[model samples]
Target: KLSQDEIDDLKEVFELFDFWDGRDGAVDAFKIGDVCRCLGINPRNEDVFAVGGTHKMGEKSLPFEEFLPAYEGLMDCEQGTYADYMEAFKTFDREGQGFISGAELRHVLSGLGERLSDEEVDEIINLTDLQEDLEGNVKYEEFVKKVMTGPY
Candidate 1:
């Protein structure tokens, strides 16, 4: 359980977060639960307090009509250019030398988290110009910069 004030704290944080995310029609492809998560809350999708949405806290950013949902929406995670992807992408840099191999990327992309399709995988792969073997390093950092700070 959480107080409406706590609810608003989370709401307010996400509001500013959302604004910084972009003022126009932008959204996260994922969650920024890390950037603004530790303000004091579950940080998971399992809690609720009802800051403003009609569904109550259970849908923290759902924005039945307005607010957080769209802010921390797709552009948040979907743009593929976010530090959000950066962090996760870095994780797959199996050698720690950077650039998680194309060999690794497709497997991980489809095997974990949102589990993108091979089509989506190739789409992202091609988008980043991560087209494999320039000497076997995927230049993931370039992908991150291009993908992370993309025009989306």
Candidate 2:
């Protein structure tokens, strides 16, 4: 089962649908950044996974990759393909900056309604090797093989 925070984050995403469906403004107005910002999340050096961004989302939502492994070990889950990793990576990177910052990652987690202590967030970042490279972004393949699949 998903944590409370995960549920809350899902709610926030649902809210985005509601806002777009109900409001006069275009849905584009509410980008991932808007959600992160509202939650005080900094998207740099953090990790956020997109739920429904695939064909499975159907007509209404971005379909989440159900095959994406759940967090295991310190954070465990199943092995995923490079493409699957990218979808998760992009969700937290609202600005397309490529790097998910600790603040931003934590914020996204918080949105899920899971209240993680600073230490908990820090541990996760440490495990992910949260850092920007010369390209100024995290590479999809490396992330999938090294961080997501290898260790915590």
Highest TM-score scorer: 1
Model 2 worst lDDT run, 10 consecutive residues: 65-74
Candidate 2 lDDT, 90-147, residue by residue in tens: 8877577566654555665554543667786667567877665665544443545664
CA-lDDT, candidates in order: 0.51, 0.46
- Show how many residue pairs clash in every candidate, following the order shown: 18, 28
State each model's C-alpha RMSD to the native.
Answer: 10.4, 15.3
Q: How does residue 131 of candidate 1 score in lDDT?
A: 61
lDDT of predicted model 1 = 0.51
TM-scores for all candidates: the values are 0.42, 0.32
Collision count of model 2: 28
- Give the CA lDDT, 0 to 100, for residue 82 in model 1: 58
Q: Tell me the deviation in Å of residue 87 in model 2.
A: 1.4
Q: For residue 90, give model 2's deviation from the true position in Å.
A: 1.5
- Give the local distance difference test score of model 2: 0.46
